[PDB]
Amino acid sequence: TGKCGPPPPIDNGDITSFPLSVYAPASSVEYQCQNLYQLEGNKRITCRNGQWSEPPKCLHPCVISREIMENYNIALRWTAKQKLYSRTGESVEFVCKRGYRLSSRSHTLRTTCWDGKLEYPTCAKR
Amino acid sequence: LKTLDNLLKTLDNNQKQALIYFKDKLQDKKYLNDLMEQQKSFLDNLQKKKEDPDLQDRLKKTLNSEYDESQFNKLLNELGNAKAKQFLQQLHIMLQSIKDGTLTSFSSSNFNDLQNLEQKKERALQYINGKLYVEYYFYINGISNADNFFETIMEYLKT
């Protein structure tokens, strides 16, 4: 029979329903991520003839480092805060600190967070 | 007064309203805290890195935060008609993008602690106003020249 067992576990995520031991053919389950994690892939998985479709992933947020910002002579735009949690897929906006100009390629002041990884711009003494 | 009229003759209603807006923020003492924080933060960097003692000693003194119409007109004259119109036009776009809720920056992580668009609009407006004020009084005080004012404020006004 085209019956599946329990749907697969995913790091920092879980299914929206209570976990059953056996699943009927063409039955489906949906996933959710932990608070600051971002779902990447399809939200739903289906039991297709004894096998589940590919589960999504829950990608890590980026933690904006005060020390990196100080070493690169940058600051967060729009805020006085030097601490920020950025989700995967979101853009982070920076500015050069006063007395510094951009030394990295243009458009590096606006950059995307991806699974805990962020490329910080660099500024150098004017 | 001739050069000032020679600039105003080249400005549309959008640029003229941005001029009224900028001048209005320069007359608002509520932004003085922003200038003192910027002053302290800039002096602390120079002290830490043991750089430019002449500038540090000027930064230990009190900055002038008084508005004067002649000094305002001198900044516009030193920028020249072209840069002054580019600056007022970009100020218009920034303010319109905040008003319309279309400012791309609104989708950034930088605003993701805020629950609604009105809060986002308020953060953006209060930050732009503080930057217009800080940049003008750093110029008035001789820490930056007209060209530095232009390039620095255009970074903050980018949409």
Author numbering:
A (entry chain B): 1106 to 1231
B (entry chain A): 44 to 202
Report text from the authors:
Important mechanism for complement evasion is acquisition of the main host complement inhibitor, factor H (FH). The main AP regulator in serum is Factor H (FH), which consists of 20 globular short consensus repeat domains called SCR or FH-domains. Binding of FH has also been described for RF agents, and a ligand for FH in B. hermsii was shown by Hovis et al. to be a plasmid-encoded, surface-exposed Factor H binding protein A (FhbA).
The structure of BhFhbA (residues 44–202) reveals a compact, single-domain fold, which is composed solely of a bundle of nine α-helices. The first five α-helices (α1-α5) wrap around the core formed by α-helices 6–9 with the overall architecture of the fold resembling a curved arc or capital letter ‘L’. The structure of BhFhbA is thus a previously uncharacterized fold and further represents a novel FH-binding scaffold. The primary and biologically relevant interface in the FH20 domain has a buried surface area of 1066 Å2, as determined by the PISA server. A careful analysis of the primary interface reveals that α-helices 6–9 of BhFhbA form a hydrophobic cavity in which FH20 sits. Within the cavity, Trp1183 of FH20 surrounded by a sandwich like stack of aromatic residues sits between two BhFhbA residues: Phe154 from the hinge region and Tyr170 from helix α8. Moreover, towards the C-terminus of FH20, Tyr199 from BhFhbA α9 forms van der Waals interactions with FH20 Val1200, with the closest approach being 3.8 Å. The structure, combined with mutagenesis and binding studies, led to the identification of a conserved aromatic residue, Phe154, that is central in binding FH. However, the interactions are different: a hydrophobic binding pocket is formed between FH20 and BhFhbA, whereas the FH20:OspE interaction is mainly electrostatic in nature and mediated by hydrogen bonds.
